[PDB]
Amino acid sequence: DKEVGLINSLELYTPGEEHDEIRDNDIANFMIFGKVSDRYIDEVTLNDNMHDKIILREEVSKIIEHIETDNDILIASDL
Amino acid sequence: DKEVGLINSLELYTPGEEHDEIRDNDIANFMIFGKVSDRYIDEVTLNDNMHDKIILREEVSKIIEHIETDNDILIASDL
Numbered sequence: 001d002k003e004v005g006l007i008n009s010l011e012l013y014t015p016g017e018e019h020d021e022i023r024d025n026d027i028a029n030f031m032i033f034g035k036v037s038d039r040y041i042d043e044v045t046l047n048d049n050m051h052d053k054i055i056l057r058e059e060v061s062k063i064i065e066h067i068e069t070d071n072d073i074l075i076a077s078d079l
Numbered sequence: 080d081k082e083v084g085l086i087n088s089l090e091l092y093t094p095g096e097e098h099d100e101i102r103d104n105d106i107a108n109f110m111i112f113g114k115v116s117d118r119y120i121d122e123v124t125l126n127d128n129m130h131d132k133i134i135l136r137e138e139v140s141k142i143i144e145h146i147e148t149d150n151d152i153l154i155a156s157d158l
């Protein structure tokens with residue numbers, strides 16, 4: 001007996017499959033109301049010249065280098 | 080003995096003659112996100128030709144007419 005089953009309390013994050021046009025409306029909504037879609041992040045996180053749409057944090061590369069060498073992460077910050 | 084004092088559980092409305100400029104972002108924020116200011120409501124009231132910025136119900140006219148004849152109002156609607 002063997003079965004893959006279903007995962008109930010966790011959801012697998014599937015990356016987007018298309019490019020969405022980004023208007024100033026989306027920038028204003030993201031920077032004011034906090035509204036965003038995962039396609040926005042997938043579009044601006046594929047390249048790295050897009051400094052007119054998201055603040056590129058330097059901790060991302062260090063965190064990725066740390067996780068790729070078998071080490072867990074614990075992020076803590078303010079409000 | 081006489082003293083006007085201060086009113087502590089109610090606030091007094093003050094209109095906004097200063098005509099604030101209106102942009103498309105204010106249209107989007109009001110229609111979608113619910114955020115709006117008092118200057119907006121004062122601006123969309125004085126002139127009745129501003130139909131591309133707010134939906135003008137016909138109930139406000141009847142409520143004003145009912146309150147001008149010393150009748151109190153009760154308004155009930157839904158979510």
Ligand SMILES: Nc1ncnc2c1ncn2[C@@H]1O[C@H](COP(=O)(O)OP(=O)(O)OP(=O)(O)O)[C@@H](O)[C@H]1O
Binds near residue numbers: 112134135156157
């Ligand atoms: N006359 C109008 N023109 C344009 N938009 C309107 C108008 N009336 C209401 N809306 C929109 O409908 C939404 C709900 O409006 P409002 O907050 O008045 O409902 P409500 O009855 O107060 O809701 P609740 O009953 O939960 O308090 C708001 O986002 C608002 O922008």
